[PDB]
Amino acid sequence: EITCQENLPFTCGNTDALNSSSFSSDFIFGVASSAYQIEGTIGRGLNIWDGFTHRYPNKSGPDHGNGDTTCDSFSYWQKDIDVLDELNATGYRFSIAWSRIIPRGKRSRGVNEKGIDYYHGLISGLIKKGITPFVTLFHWDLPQTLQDEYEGFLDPQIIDDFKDYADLCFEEFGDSVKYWLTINQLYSVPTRGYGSALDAPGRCSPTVDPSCYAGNSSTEPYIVAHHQLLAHAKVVDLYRKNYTHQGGKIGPTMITRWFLPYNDTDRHSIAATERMKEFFLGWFMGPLTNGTYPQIMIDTVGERLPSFSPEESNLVKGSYDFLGLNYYFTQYAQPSPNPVNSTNHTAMMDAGAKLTYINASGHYIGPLFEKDKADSTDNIYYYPKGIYSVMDYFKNKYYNPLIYVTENGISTPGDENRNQSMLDYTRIDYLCSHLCFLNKVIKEKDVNVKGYLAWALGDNYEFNKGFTVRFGLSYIDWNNVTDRDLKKSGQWYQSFISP
Amino acid sequence: EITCQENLPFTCGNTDALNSSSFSSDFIFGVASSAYQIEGTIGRGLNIWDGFTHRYPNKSGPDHGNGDTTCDSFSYWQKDIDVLDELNATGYRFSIAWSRIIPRGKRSRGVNEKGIDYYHGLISGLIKKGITPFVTLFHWDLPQTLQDEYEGFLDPQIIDDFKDYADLCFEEFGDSVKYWLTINQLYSVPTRGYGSALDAPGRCSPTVDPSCYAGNSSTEPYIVAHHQLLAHAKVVDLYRKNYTHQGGKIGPTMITRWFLPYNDTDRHSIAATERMKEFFLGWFMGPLTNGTYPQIMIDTVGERLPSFSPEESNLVKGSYDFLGLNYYFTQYAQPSPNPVNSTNHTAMMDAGAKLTYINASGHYIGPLFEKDKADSTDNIYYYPKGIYSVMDYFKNKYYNPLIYVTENGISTPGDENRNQSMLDYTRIDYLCSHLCFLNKVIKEKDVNVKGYLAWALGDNYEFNKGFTVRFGLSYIDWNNVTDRDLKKSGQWYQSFISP
Numbered sequence: 001e002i003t004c005q006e007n008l009p010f011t012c013g014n015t016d017a018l019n020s021s022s023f024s025s026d027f028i029f030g031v032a033s034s035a036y037q038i039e040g041t042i043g044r045g046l047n048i049w050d051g052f053t054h055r056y057p058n059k060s061g062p063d064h065g066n067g068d069t070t071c072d073s074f075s076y077w078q079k080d081i082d083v084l085d086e087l088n089a090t091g092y093r094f095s096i097a098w099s100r101i102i103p104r105g106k107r108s109r110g111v112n113e114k115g116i117d118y119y120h121g122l123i124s125g126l127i128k129k130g131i132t133p134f135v136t137l138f139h140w141d142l143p144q145t146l147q148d149e150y151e152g153f154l155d156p157q158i159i160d161d162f163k164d165y166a167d168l169c170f171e172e173f174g175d176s177v178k179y180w181l182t183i184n185q186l187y188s189v190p191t192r193g194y195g196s197a198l199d200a201p202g203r204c205s206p207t208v209d210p211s212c213y214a215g216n217s218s219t220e221p222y223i224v225a226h227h228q229l230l231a232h233a234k235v236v237d238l239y240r241k242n243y244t245h246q247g248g249k250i251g252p253t254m255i256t257r258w259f260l261p262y263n264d265t266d267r268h269s270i271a272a273t274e275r276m277k278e279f280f281l282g283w284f285m286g287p288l289t290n291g292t293y294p295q296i297m298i299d300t301v302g303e304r305l306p307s308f309s310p311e312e313s314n315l316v317k318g319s320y321d322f323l324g325l326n327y328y329f330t331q332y333a334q335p336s337p338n339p340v341n342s343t344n345h346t347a348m349m350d351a352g353a354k355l356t357y358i359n360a361s362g363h364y365i366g367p368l369f370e371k372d373k374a375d376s377t378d379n380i381y382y383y384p385k386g387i388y389s390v391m392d393y394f395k396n397k398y399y400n401p402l403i404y405v406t407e408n409g410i411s412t413p414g415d416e417n418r419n420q421s422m423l424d425y426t427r428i429d430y431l432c433s434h435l436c437f438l439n440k441v442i443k444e445k446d447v448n449v450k451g452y453l454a455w456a457l458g459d460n461y462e463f464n465k466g467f468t469v470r471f472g473l474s475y476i477d478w479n480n481v482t483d484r485d486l487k488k489s490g491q492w493y494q495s496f497i498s499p
Numbered sequence: 500e501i502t503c504q505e506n507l508p509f510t511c512g513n514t515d516a517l518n519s520s521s522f523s524s525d526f527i528f529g530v531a532s533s534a535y536q537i538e539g540t541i542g543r544g545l546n547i548w549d550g551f552t553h554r555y556p557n558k559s560g561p562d563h564g565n566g567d568t569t570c571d572s573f574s575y576w577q578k579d580i581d582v583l584d585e586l587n588a589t590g591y592r593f594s595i596a597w598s599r600i601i602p603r604g605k606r607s608r609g610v611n612e613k614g615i616d617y618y619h620g621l622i623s624g625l626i627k628k629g630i631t632p633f634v635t636l637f638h639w640d641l642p643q644t645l646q647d648e649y650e651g652f653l654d655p656q657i658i659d660d661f662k663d664y665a666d667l668c669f670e671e672f673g674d675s676v677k678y679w680l681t682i683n684q685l686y687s688v689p690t691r692g693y694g695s696a697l698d699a700p701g702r703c704s705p706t707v708d709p710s711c712y713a714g715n716s717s718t719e720p721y722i723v724a725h726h727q728l729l730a731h732a733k734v735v736d737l738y739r740k741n742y743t744h745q746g747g748k749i750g751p752t753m754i755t756r757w758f759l760p761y762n763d764t765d766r767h768s769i770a771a772t773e774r775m776k777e778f779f780l781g782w783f784m785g786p787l788t789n790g791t792y793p794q795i796m797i798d799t800v801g802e803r804l805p806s807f808s809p810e811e812s813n814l815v816k817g818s819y820d821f822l823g824l825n826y827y828f829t830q831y832a833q834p835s836p837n838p839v840n841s842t843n844h845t846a847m848m849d850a851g852a853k854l855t856y857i858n859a860s861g862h863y864i865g866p867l868f869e870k871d872k873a874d875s876t877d878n879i880y881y882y883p884k885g886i887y888s889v890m891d892y893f894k895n896k897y898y899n900p901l902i903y904v905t906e907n908g909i910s911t912p913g914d915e916n917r918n919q920s921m922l923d924y925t926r927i928d929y930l931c932s933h934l935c936f937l938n939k940v941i942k943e944k945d946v947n948v949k950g951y952l953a954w955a956l957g958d959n960y961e962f963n964k965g966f967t968v969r970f971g972l973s974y975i976d977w978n979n980v981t982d983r984d985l986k987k988s989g990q991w992y993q994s995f996i997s998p
């Protein structure tokens with residue numbers, strides 16, 4: 001019988017009590033990254049994260065930091081491999097920058113052979129060290145030209161441009177890559193990119209954020225989400241019909257959260273919590289497992305929710321061999337009004353829920369996850385049991401999928417000096433506490449989870465935060481980015497992997 | 500009788516001997532800038548100077564510097580006005596960033612109202628201080644989307660997109676702006692952007708520079724130059740047919756140089772020198788005054804030289820109310836082979852001339868203009884009499900045009916500390932020596948020159964050099980860019996203007 005801790009102090013950092021041998025022998029352990037966050041702009045075209053961070057510098061991070069040079073994994077990809085080799089990792093999730101291999105967006109405009117060679121060398125070097133690549137096609141870095149020609153995922157033209165890009169990736173790299181992810185965290189661009197405008201491309205309703213160049217927070221998240229699903233599904237059909245000889249697997253990435261009632265004896269809070277599961281997870285998982293959006297979304301969102309044609313429904317339903325599930329935290333849910341006629345209405349309001357980390361009796365859900373120095377009541381807190389609840393729910397609600405946990409991690413402040421930053425015991429505690437619950441749900445619920453990739457390999461440009469926070473299991477000095485030095489957490493993870 | 504010095508020491512920094520009263524009362528004096536170099540990316544889309552400096556950082560400058568933030572004239576435009584007001588300048592040449600007012604390139608995709616407001620406020624503030632704007636529509640910063648859709652000026656699609664952009668500028672700003680420049684230095688993009696790939700977009704033949712993403716140095720300069728001429732001319736026709744009510748004037752900008760024979764008693768060197776005038780100046784001035792390219796270009800360049808249709812010839816011929824002539828230096832010319840079959844052939848080789856600053860008897864043409872620390876034999880030297888020779892030649896060869904000198908200036912090294920940088924006596928000497936000769940050619944040759952705008956208002960991002968050189972008459976601290984402090988040269992120019 002497995003017992004896992006939910007509150008500090010944690011004791012799961014002792015590899016005598018929790019280690020890779022606690023899991024099945026075939027289980028994959030590694031780390032994750034994304035191309036905008038680590039490579040730098042050298043050698044690639046420009047994408048909407050370049051555009052957004054340059055046009056709206058105060059949304060790039062408090063430091064106005066961006067991905068221009070970052071940790072220079074363009075130059076230092078071998079040093080990334082060396083971290084993975086030091087860890088004895090068996091998996092690495094990275095993304096391909098579309099703008100590196102097709103700078104002009106549309107494949108017929110030509111490819112960047114040198115860009116293709118960069119990924120070929122990375123892939124070869126990973127395989128040579130026994131590391132299985134998990135490759136994300138699209139981690140948000142859409143070529144700027146596509147955004148400017150047709151507003152990117154706002155238009156159905158994205159579908160064919162994404163498909164041609166993916167086809168190029170399968171053709172060039174699929175002989176060696178056997179695990180593909182389509183779109184990172186389906187929820188994120190619709191809501192953050194086209195709802196709140198926290199993220200590229202930065203569209204919203206005028207009264208939501210007067211800085212947005214265009215948009216409609218009430219409608220565009222749904223359009224974008226629908227096109228993401230169709231683009232994803234077209235790519236999965238291409239993969240499975242034209243690249244079956246490669247013997248690989250493909251899936252989307254979901255951002256997952258658990259949700260608990262703000263007040264667990266209040267029917268209204270309980271209802272809000274179930275609405276959140278449908279609006280946050282089901283928005284994408286309903287289409288992926290059934291070809292339709294959740295009924296509560298159909299009912300609430302009304303004419304703002306696009307329909308799938310019968311052909312589209314069939315394409316989207318079942319369009320995965322596995323799911324990449326990212327998990328960071330859990331929220332309490334309580335009712336909230338949905339003012340659809342308000343000029344500042346957003347799609348996120350349609351769930352009719354307000355989300356917190358503190359429940360009605362004042363209980364904070366778990367340890368600190370992210371401090372917000374401008375407003376401490378907005379701090380995020382984590383909840384290790386949430387990974388168990390999420391995986392259990394996916395097995396039960398969504399037809400017992402094959403799952404890889406494709407991100408899980410925690411930041412530490414960029415104001416810490418190097419010594420404090422390397423003594424990242426808070427990261428050991430976060431990682432180990434989640435891994436305890438992940439082992440527990442695999443054993444107790446028989447969820448088909450076959451790997452775990454912690455966020456992040458190294459310190460990088462963090463979307464929305466610049467270099468003001470660090471997520472790496474290895475430290476990078478921003479004054480000289482060559483080295484990636486294992487932190488206490490990297491050292492711990494090394495021992496967890498090879499106890 | 501006016502006597503001007505050609506060699507150090509100069510004595511023209513004494514405003515008792517040379518000042519604005521030396522010129523006609525209506526003569527305009529000021530300074531110049533360009534949008535990529537001064538504004539920063541905040542509030543605008545991305546352009547090919549963003550793209551080029553990010554994809555090829557070692558071509559942006561030795562420091563890998565770029566225009567991301569630069570002197571932040573987006574924020575500090577009023578401080579630019581204050582410099583001009585301190586100088587008692589009567590003119591200011593600046594450029595409009597296409598990506599600031601139409602981030603998506605094509606006007607039908609929408610305009611950036613806030614971008615338009617930025618130029619409205621600058622224009623209003625200049626006029627309120629009695630400063631005449633001279634506005635460049637296109638100082639090289641093409642929206643990246645246009646380069647990625649159709650390779651920008653490589654394709655005839657540029658013509659209509661440039662025309663719609665210019666129409667927007669005339670409509671929004673032409674009530675107040677009465678002097679417009681179309682394309683900065685017609686020679687520069689074809690040769691540097693598509694020939695040597697020193698400049699955005701960075702296209703060339705593979706063996707010229709293996710880093711270029713695509714191109715053909717032998718053909719593309721001519722295509723690009725031809726499209727620039729047609730785009731320019733379409734804009735001038737639009738201006739003169741649809742905006743005649745505004746009572747303004749429009750013209751192109753030329754980069755001018757003088758050329759002297761490397762050996763002035765060698766017929767081959769003399770012939771190379773005349774070929775250089777045709778290939779460097781006539782490439783554009785032949786079309787602008789006659790609707791045709793120079794005969795030597797027709798003969799040499801052959802099938803690589805595009806033809807104008809009769810309609811196009813008519814559009815281009817006479818397509819200026821004035822010429823903006825930029826002038827920095829003069830070269831000696833000697834014969835050089837033109838290996839048209841070589842894989843590394845460039846359009847610049849077609850002139851059949853090698854250019855130097857030292858003549859056959861070892862004479863350096865004038866004082867140091869730019870030191871090249873990697874190779875001192877490649878230092879540039881200036882030649883004050885060259886501005887007299889250029890203006891004289893334009894009057895005689897090109898039908899007595901109205902001229903404004905739209906750039907003239909010199910750098911000092913970015914390795915100098917602030918005190919050395921502020922004691923920029925070398926810049927006083929360069930500026931005054933050219934102004935002496937400019938007054939001399941107006942008086943002796945009756946060239947219709949009506950203003951002079953020194954490069955640059957302030958220190959900025961220098962194309963190809965980053966922040967490793969400074970051109971300003973006012974100093975900017977890169978650690979805190981708010982202030983623009985008049986250097987010795989700015990102080991001198993203040994006294995020259997108001998002696």
Ligand SMILES: *[C@@H]1O[C@H](CO)[C@@H](O[C@@H]2O[C@H](CO)[C@@H](O[C@@H]3O[C@H](CO[C@H]4O[C@H](CO)[C@@H](O)[C@H](O)[C@@H]4O)[C@@H](O)[C@H](O[C@H]4O[C@H](CO)[C@@H](O)[C@H](O)[C@@H]4O)[C@@H]3O[C@@H]3OC[C@@H](O)[C@H](O)[C@H]3O)[C@H](O)[C@H]2NC(C)=O)[C@H](O[C@@H]2O[C@@H](C)[C@@H](O)[C@@H](O)[C@@H]2O)[C@H]1NC(C)=O
Nearest residue numbers: 286287289290291292293294295296298299302307308313
């Ligand atoms: C899994 O996918 C299944 C589909 O493959 C989902 O089942 C569908 O659920 C639909 C409701 O979402 C249901 O459609 C309704 O059909 C009513 C019946 O119509 C038939 O007879 C009519 C009946 O009187 C007639 O007009 C029709 O022409 C048909 O003959 C019908 O009115 C409903 O429409 C109203 O409601 C929808 C909102 O739901 C409005 O958009 C619409 O304007 C109208 O006001 C609805 O019809 C659907 O209307 C929209 C149109 O685009 C659709 O094509 C039309 O179908 C549908 O019958 C079933 N299909 C079957 C095959 O069962 C299933 O839904 C879950 O399970 C069903 C039983 C129900 O409980 C749903 O609430 C649950 O979500 C999906 N499962 C999951 C878990 O999502």
Ligand SMILES: *[C@@H]1O[C@H](CO)[C@@H](O[C@@H]2O[C@H](CO)[C@@H](O[C@@H]3O[C@H](CO[C@H]4O[C@H](CO)[C@@H](O)[C@H](O)[C@@H]4O)[C@@H](O)[C@H](O[C@H]4O[C@H](CO)[C@@H](O)[C@H](O)[C@@H]4O)[C@@H]3O[C@@H]3OC[C@@H](O)[C@H](O)[C@H]3O)[C@H](O)[C@H]2NC(C)=O)[C@H](O[C@@H]2O[C@@H](C)[C@@H](O)[C@@H](O)[C@@H]2O)[C@H]1NC(C)=O
Nearest residue numbers: 785786788789790791792793794795797798801806807812
């Ligand atoms: C100012 O613009 C003026 C034009 O508005 C320039 O004058 C033109 O100069 C052209 C040479 O560049 C000259 O064209 C030549 O015409 C020859 C005569 O053709 C007529 O009779 C033929 C004659 O036997 C016949 O085939 C034709 O159909 C006509 O009836 C002719 O062969 C020349 O073509 C050969 O040379 C050109 C290269 O120059 C090759 O490209 C071509 O394949 C061929 O091998 C040339 O014909 C032109 O050929 C190219 C085609 O695209 C053109 O349309 C065709 O015209 C033309 O006659 C005159 N036009 C007139 C009205 O004078 C003027 O040029 C300068 O002055 C002229 C006198 C001459 O000295 C030029 O060298 C000077 O540059 C321009 N001024 C300046 C300063 O540039």
Ligand SMILES: *[C@@H]1O[C@H](CO)[C@@H](O[C@@H]2O[C@H](CO)[C@@H](O[C@@H]3O[C@H](CO)[C@@H](O)[C@H](O)[C@@H]3O[C@@H]3OC[C@@H](O)[C@H](O)[C@H]3O)[C@H](O)[C@H]2NC(C)=O)[C@H](O[C@@H]2O[C@@H](C)[C@@H](O)[C@@H](O)[C@@H]2O)[C@H]1NC(C)=O
Nearest residue numbers: 261262263264265266267268269270334359360361362363
């Ligand atoms: C978790 O949710 C539960 C269920 O909603 C909360 O319990 C409910 O709390 C209500 C107050 O928020 C109680 O109603 C009040 O009852 C007294 C007694 O008559 C009355 O004077 C109040 O006016 C009020 O009555 C309501 O007035 C509005 C009407 O529309 C409604 O019909 C009336 O009920 C309600 O009785 C109680 N329900 C139950 C089943 O206990 C619970 O609130 C916490 O516990 C309750 C017992 C009370 O001590 C609250 O102070 C305390 O907040 C909530 N838990 C938390 C921690 O918020």
Ligand SMILES: *[C@@H]1O[C@H](CO)[C@@H](O[C@@H]2O[C@H](CO)[C@@H](O[C@@H]3O[C@H](CO)[C@@H](O)[C@H](O)[C@@H]3O[C@@H]3OC[C@@H](O)[C@H](O)[C@H]3O)[C@H](O)[C@H]2NC(C)=O)[C@H](O[C@@H]2O[C@@H](C)[C@@H](O)[C@@H](O)[C@@H]2O)[C@H]1NC(C)=O
Nearest residue numbers: 760761762763764765766767768769833858859860861862
């Ligand atoms: C400026 O250009 C002028 C004109 O080209 C240079 O003067 C010419 O310089 C040539 C040498 O580069 C002289 O030719 C040589 O003459 C001696 C006497 O016969 C002979 O032994 C050489 O072989 C050579 O002769 C040529 O050989 C190649 C044949 O194809 C050609 O037909 C022969 O002429 C040439 O006489 C002279 N021309 C004139 C009109 O003086 C001039 O060069 C400078 O001055 C000349 C006089 C000489 O002192 C050169 O050393 C010196 O460089 C050049 N000025 C400079 C500074 O380069």
Ligand SMILES: *[C@@H]1O[C@H](CO)[C@@H](O[C@@H]2O[C@H](CO)[C@@H](O)[C@H](O)[C@H]2NC(C)=O)[C@H](O)[C@H]1NC(C)=O
Nearest residue numbers: 205206207215216217218219303304340343344
């Ligand atoms: C968001 O786009 C929607 C749909 O075009 C706009 O909502 C409509 O508002 C128009 C004008 O009020 C109404 O006539 C329709 O009834 C509404 N349709 C629905 C589906 O709500 C909405 O105003 C736009 N929001 C913004 C801020 O522009």
Ligand SMILES: *[C@@H]1O[C@H](CO)[C@@H](O[C@@H]2O[C@H](CO)[C@@H](O)[C@H](O)[C@H]2NC(C)=O)[C@H](O)[C@H]1NC(C)=O
Nearest residue numbers: 704705706714715716717718802803839842843
């Ligand atoms: C530059 O483009 C030109 C024109 O397409 C190429 O020149 C031709 O070379 C082809 C193959 O040799 C020849 O058949 C033609 O005779 C040439 N045409 C002319 C106008 O020269 C040239 O090879 C390309 N250069 C590069 C480096 O690609």
Ligand SMILES: *[C@@H]1O[C@H](CO)[C@@H](O)[C@H](O)[C@H]1NC(C)=O
Nearest residue numbers: 015016017018019021022499
């Ligand atoms: C691994 O952890 C398991 C408990 O899950 C323990 O039985 C085993 O001894 C540990 N392995 C090592 C080498 O410590």
Ligand SMILES: *[C@@H]1O[C@H](CO)[C@@H](O)[C@H](O)[C@H]1NC(C)=O
Nearest residue numbers: 055056057058059210211542
């Ligand atoms: C941030 O920048 C935008 C311009 O993009 C401006 O609208 C906003 O007020 C600035 N934010 C703050 C907090 O100053």
Ligand SMILES: *[C@@H]1O[C@H](CO)[C@@H](O)[C@H](O)[C@H]1NC(C)=O
Nearest residue numbers: 163234235237238239241242
């Ligand atoms: C498969 O590849 C062929 C050949 O390139 C293509 O034409 C066919 O339409 C593709 N199939 C997809 C997505 O099924």
Ligand SMILES: *[C@@H]1O[C@H](CO)[C@@H](O)[C@H](O)[C@H]1NC(C)=O
Nearest residue numbers: 207208339342343344345346
């Ligand atoms: C608009 O929403 C903001 C936050 O979503 C809120 O502060 C404000 O009350 C809302 N305004 C109206 C008019 O509803």
Ligand SMILES: *[C@@H]1O[C@H](CO)[C@@H](O)[C@H](O)[C@H]1NC(C)=O
Nearest residue numbers: 477479480481482483484485
């Ligand atoms: C930068 O870091 C690398 C790796 O430690 C080191 O080899 C190189 O000397 C360092 N350079 C400087 C300037 O610190």
Ligand SMILES: *[C@@H]1O[C@H](CO)[C@@H](O)[C@H](O)[C@H]1NC(C)=O
Nearest residue numbers: 020087088089494497498499
């Ligand atoms: C690598 O992991 C494998 C599999 O558990 C183990 O046999 C090997 O000893 C480990 N290597 C190191 C250096 O830890």
Ligand SMILES: *[C@@H]1O[C@H](CO)[C@@H](O)[C@H](O)[C@H]1NC(C)=O
Nearest residue numbers: 514515516517518520521998
């Ligand atoms: C201006 O220079 C002229 C010579 O060009 C001289 O006559 C005049 O005195 C000078 N003006 C002043 C105020 O020094």
Ligand SMILES: *[C@@H]1O[C@H](CO)[C@@H](O)[C@H](O)[C@H]1NC(C)=O
Nearest residue numbers: 043554555556557558709710
């Ligand atoms: C500069 O960068 C390019 C890649 O854009 C590379 O080809 C070239 O060798 C580098 N230059 C030097 C001098 O190292």
Ligand SMILES: *[C@@H]1O[C@H](CO)[C@@H](O)[C@H](O)[C@H]1NC(C)=O
Nearest residue numbers: 662733734736737738740741
């Ligand atoms: C003039 O403006 C009209 C109306 O917008 C336009 O349709 C006409 O073609 C334009 N003319 C040019 C460049 O002459």
Ligand SMILES: *[C@@H]1O[C@H](CO)[C@@H](O)[C@H](O)[C@H]1NC(C)=O
Nearest residue numbers: 706707838841842843844845
């Ligand atoms: C190519 O040109 C370069 C410089 O233009 C020169 O060094 C070289 O000799 C040329 N090569 C050939 C094969 O002509």
